[PDB]
């Protein structure tokens, strides 16, 4: 049966990928492209916006269809869900506040308080590096940057165009983003384990965006030329 509703597990506190306009509407990246999938698969989408480290759950307990949420493919993952081809080539970054010069770096973590998204490949990243630093994890990325607005963190680790994001859309914090990387975090679109059926069409509604113009659309409405 192919269903008429596909119930899309994905961020709310994660721009530009997954966030809320001013009247409290889902927007971002993801989310566009969610709607361009189901668009080619005949469907309709029912966002279920929610906490990073829910979502593999999620997946897994039938609470949603698909994950379009700047979910990396890693290796372990693909022991818990199947993924589309990527969609999409991240980064990390570290926010700091513009005061500091100490950190440029992982490296620079050392004996530092440093908050990361619970569940997420950052969180994996500075367990590694941690020398003594301490780890503070959180359930959505907002609360991270609330630390390190208040100052019970003195940074938050994040992928590139989230942490750049977050920077844009807080002038008043005065911070600032350090350590950047440009690639090594693929993004995927997640289905239950064997669900091949969904994830064949998926995939195809994805070659068929790259080609058709509908994909650099999205790309360029967030992030330019
Ligand atoms: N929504 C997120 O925090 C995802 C971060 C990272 N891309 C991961 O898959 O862990």
């Given at each position: 049966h192919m269903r008429g509703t596909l119930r899309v597990g994905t961020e709310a506190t994660f721009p530009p990928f997954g966030f809320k306009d001013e009247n409290g509407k889902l927007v971002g990246f993801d989310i566009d492209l969610a709607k361009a999938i189901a668009k080619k698969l005949?469907?309709?989408?029912?966002?279920?916006?929610?906490?990073?480290?829910?979502?593999?759950?999620?997946?897994?307990?039938?609470?949603?269809?698909?994950?379009?949420?700047?979910?990396?493919?890693?290796?372990?993952?693909?022991?818990?869900?199947?993924?589309?081809?990527?969609?999409?080539?991240?980064?990390?970054?570290?926010?700091?506040?513009?005061?500091?010069?100490?950190?440029?770096?992982?490296?620079?973590?050392?004996?530092?308080?440093?908050?990361?998204?619970?569940?997420?490949?950052?969180?994996?990243?500075?367990?590694?590096?941690?020398?003594?630093?301490?780890?503070?994890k959180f359930d959505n990325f907002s609360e991270a940057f609330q630390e390190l607005k208040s100052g019970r963190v003195d940074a938050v680790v994040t992928d590139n165009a989230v942490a750049l994001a977050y920077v844009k859309q807080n002038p008043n914090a005065g911070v600032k983003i350090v350590g950047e990387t440009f690639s090594g975090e693929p993004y995927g679109i997640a289905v239950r384990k064997g669900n091949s059926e969904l994830l064949?069409?998926?995939?195809?509604?994805?070659?068929?965006?790259?080609?058709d113009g509908t994909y650099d659309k999205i790309y360029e409405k967030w992030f330019g030329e």
């Open positions: 005949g469907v309709k989408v029912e966002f279920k916006p929610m906490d990073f480290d829910g979502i593999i759950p999620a997946l897994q307990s039938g609470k949603i269809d698909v994950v379009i949420a700047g979910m990396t493919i890693t290796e372990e993952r693909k022991k818990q869900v199947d993924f589309s081809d990527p969609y999409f080539e991240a980064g990390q970054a570290i926010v700091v506040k513009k005061g500091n010069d100490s950190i440029k770096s992982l490296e620079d973590l050392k004996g530092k308080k440093v908050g990361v998204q619970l569940g997420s490949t950052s969180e994996q990243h500075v367990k590694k590096v941690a020398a003594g630093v301490k780890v503070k064949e069409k998926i995939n195809k509604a994805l070659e068929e965006m790259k080609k």
